[PDB]
Amino acid sequence: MELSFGARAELPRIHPVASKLLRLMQKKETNLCLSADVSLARELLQLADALGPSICMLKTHVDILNDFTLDVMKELITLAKCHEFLIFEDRKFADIGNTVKKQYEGGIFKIASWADLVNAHVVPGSGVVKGLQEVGLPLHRGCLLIAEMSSTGSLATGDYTRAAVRMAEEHSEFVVGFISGSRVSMKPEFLHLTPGVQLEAGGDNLGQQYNSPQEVIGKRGSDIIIVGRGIISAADRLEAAEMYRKAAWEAYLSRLG
Amino acid sequence: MELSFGARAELPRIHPVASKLLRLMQKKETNLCLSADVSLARELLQLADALGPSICMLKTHVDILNDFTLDVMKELITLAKCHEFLIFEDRKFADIGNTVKKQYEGGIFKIASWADLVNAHVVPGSGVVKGLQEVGLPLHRGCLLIAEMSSTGSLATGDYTRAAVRMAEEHSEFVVGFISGSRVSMKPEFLHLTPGVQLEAGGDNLGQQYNSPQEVIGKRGSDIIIVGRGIISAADRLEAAEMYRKAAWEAYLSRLG
Numbered sequence: 001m002e003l004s005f006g007a008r009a010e011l012p013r014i015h016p017v018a019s020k021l022l023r024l025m026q027k028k029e030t031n032l033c034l035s036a037d038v039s040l041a042r043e044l045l046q047l048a049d050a051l052g053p054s055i056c057m058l059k060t061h062v063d064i065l066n067d068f069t070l071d072v073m074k075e076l077i078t079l080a081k082c083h084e085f086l087i088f089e090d091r092k093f094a095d096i097g098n099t100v101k102k103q104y105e106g107g108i109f110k111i112a113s114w115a116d117l118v119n120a121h122v123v124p125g126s127g128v129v130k131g132l133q134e135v136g137l138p139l140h141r142g143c144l145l146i147a148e149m150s151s152t153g154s155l156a157t158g159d160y161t162r163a164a165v166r167m168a169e170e171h172s173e174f175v176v177g178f179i180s181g182s183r184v185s186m187k188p189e190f191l192h193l194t195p196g197v198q199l200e201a202g203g204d205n206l207g208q209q210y211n212s213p214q215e216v217i218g219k220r221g222s223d224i225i226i227v228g229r230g231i232i233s234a235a236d237r238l239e240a241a242e243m244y245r246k247a248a249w250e251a252y253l254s255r256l257g
Numbered sequence: 258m259e260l261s262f263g264a265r266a267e268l269p270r271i272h273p274v275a276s277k278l279l280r281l282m283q284k285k286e287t288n289l290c291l292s293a294d295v296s297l298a299r300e301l302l303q304l305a306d307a308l309g310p311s312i313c314m315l316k317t318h319v320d321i322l323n324d325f326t327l328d329v330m331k332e333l334i335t336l337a338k339c340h341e342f343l344i345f346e347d348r349k350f351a352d353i354g355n356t357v358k359k360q361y362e363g364g365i366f367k368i369a370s371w372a373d374l375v376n377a378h379v380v381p382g383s384g385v386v387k388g389l390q391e392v393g394l395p396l397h398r399g400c401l402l403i404a405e406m407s408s409t410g411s412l413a414t415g416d417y418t419r420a421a422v423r424m425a426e427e428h429s430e431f432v433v434g435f436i437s438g439s440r441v442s443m444k445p446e447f448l449h450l451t452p453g454v455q456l457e458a459g460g461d462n463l464g465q466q467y468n469s470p471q472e473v474i475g476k477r478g479s480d481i482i483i484v485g486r487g488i489i490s491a492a493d494r495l496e497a498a499e500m501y502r503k504a505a506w507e508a509y510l511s512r513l514g
């Protein structure tokens with residue numbers, strides 16, 4: 001039997017970051033993660049402020065921000081705390097353990113100092129998670145494993161996807177769920193976040209493929225939709241985010257019965 | 258038939274970046290790529306200057322440099338031209354095409370502006386290469402595809418590796434070879450670069466595995482060794498680099514006949 005997000009937030013084995021996320025999703029009636037793929041700090045902060053009430057999470061690509069500074073991230077955290085959403089840096093860590101630990105803690109971005117969540121590819125084997133958790137666990141962070149991808153020709157299928165699920169289950173002190181196109185784990189403590197989402201059918205011309213909120217939340221069992229251009233390219237971004245939120249939320253309600 | 262680097266530099270289908278590399282390898286008698294895994298720009302530059310004559314390539318992780326600026330990269334380019342080596346940013350692009358094109362061109366690092374070579378994971382499908390190609394093709398850059406990894410539990414095996422090779426063959430205007438543990442293509446226009454190399458046996462505590470230069474270049478047919486800690490942890494990094502250069506070069510001379 002399917003548990004509500006609010007019930008899942010209280011599960012004995014729930015990770016604290018997942019619990020915080022699930023509580024705010026239930027409170028705000030949102031399972032929408034905004035992909036804020038912008039090149040200017042001022043745009044990132046403007047979108048975070050305007051759309052924060054509608055989202056459970058803001059997904060960043062800090063390596064595309066032309067004017068990144070750590071002060072920009074302090075301010076983004078202020079917005080996150082005010083509007084109540086988590087920050088997910090879509091770094092897709094994919095190196096050996098010794099390297100990802102430095103990529104996560106250090107350099108100019110100091111990602112672990114501000115991202116509630118990050119993600120990682122499972123291709124290197126479990127050392128990728130072991131390296132990240134050395135940094136993440138003291139800093140009370142979580143990680144999502146990339147179990148499937150939305151893009152055409154993705155090799156994250158079959159036994160690869162199964163390997164991701166097993167890695168997550170063996171590292172549940174740090175891994176809180178998955179980037180996937182559908183539910184891949186039956187354990188309710190794991191979150192499923194699904195990119196490649198738009199209301200209408202289609203793709204882009206660099207291999208992105210889209211499915212609808214109803215398909216991915218309702219039929220495929222995922223928890224959260226990740227939406228970028230579907231919102232950002234709209235004339236009215238506030239209305240667009242509300243359309244996506246209401247779509248994802250009602251799809252969740254229906255599955256829950 | 259085993260061809261010399263200098264001969265391969267003249268192959269009909271050879272990418273200009275690959276030709277430049279193969280020519281300097283021949284001239285300098287080096288098939289060593291230094292993995293300059295350091296956090297200070299002053300150390301990176303001092304290594305690049307001192308070790309420049311011994312190496313064919315310097316591999317960077319710019320996202321671990323605490324004091325990155327584009328001025329540091331300007332000075333690295335100057336040393337690369339002075340000493341004749343290529344700059345390889347080990348970014349391991351691994352996102353959909355629309356994203357990676359921005360990650361390569363933009364942000365604070367502006368990687369395309371200074372890196373001769375970058376690498377990509379093939380797990381997203383060929384959109385990853387298409388996205389990078391939009392930026393790198395006119396700049397005469399090249400890309401390496403990650404066909405195998407050195408770390409324990411690596412999923413880059415079997416049909417995954419075969420997919421990487423197919424993708425390289427289908428995008429040979431931009432893809433110039435592979436990160437792999439052994440020869441994966443018999444096409445001599447492709448470079449093979451192999452990480453997880455130390456003179457001594459072992460690994461690290463986070464999944465890295467090591468094989469010797471003789472094994473990797475001599476028995477497994479790779480072209481270039483990528484060496485980090487085997488050199489960087491030495492008291493005298495120049496002496497260490499010379500030892501690795503001689504090991505790798507003599508192993509290559511041996512399979513030539």
Ligand SMILES: N#Cc1cc(=O)[nH]c(=O)n1[C@@H]1O[C@H](COP(=O)(O)O)[C@@H](O)[C@H]1O
Pocket residue numbers: 035037061090148149150151179195196197208226227228229230352353356
């Ligand atoms: N997360 C993620 C990731 C993996 C995946 O499999 N598919 C994606 O589209 N993404 C990311 O989600 C966003 C998709 O945005 P859009 O909705 O296609 O504009 C991008 O930031 C992309 O890099």
Ligand SMILES: N#Cc1cc(=O)[nH]c(=O)n1[C@@H]1O[C@H](COP(=O)(O)O)[C@@H](O)[C@H]1O
Pocket residue numbers: 095096099292294318347405406407408436452453454465483484485486487
């Ligand atoms: N290239 C690469 C990459 C992929 C791989 O499969 N194995 C690696 O060790 N690496 C990188 O090579 C270097 C290995 O360094 P070391 O020789 O283990 O100190 C690191 O910068 C690591 O991130």
